[PDB]
Design a protein around this nucleic acid. Sequence first.
RNA 1: AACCCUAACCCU
Lengths: 72, 69
Amino acid sequence: KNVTLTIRLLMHGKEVGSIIGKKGESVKKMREESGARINISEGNCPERIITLAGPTNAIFKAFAMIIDKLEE
Amino acid sequence: TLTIRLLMHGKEVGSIIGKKGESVKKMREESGARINISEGNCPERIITLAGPTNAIFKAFAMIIDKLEE
RNA sequence: AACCCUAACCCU
C-alpha cells in the first residue's frame, strides 16, 4: 500500500514550454508548493515526458497546477 | 475540453481496467471523462483522459487510488 | 456461487 507514487505524463513541447516558464519560474513554484518531485525530460524534442513522484497528495497538487497552466 | 496522456507500465494498466474492465467502466461512468487505453499487451501503454477539467480530475484521482492499492 | 483464494485484472 505504498504512499509514494510515480506517474508519467506524456507532453508536446509547446505545452512543456509554459509548464517550465520564463527562466523555469513556473515549475520552480510548482516544485515548492506541491512538494512533489517534478522532472522534465530534457532536449527540445517535440514529444516530452513529465515525471511527478511523491506522496499521493503532492502528486495531485502538481497535477492540478499543470492542468491549471495548460488551461491558463 | 482538455486532453492529458499518462504514460504507464503494463502491470499498472492491469489494475486500471480490472477483472473484465469493471474498474475502468466505473471510471468512465463516474468521471464522465473519456478514457482510452492504448492497445496491446505492450509493456509500455498510453492512457488518454479527455473532457472538462473536472472529469479529468475525477479520472485522474481514481487512477491515483488504483496505483496506491 | 462455489470448500473460491491469489495474481493478474485487457476494457473501449
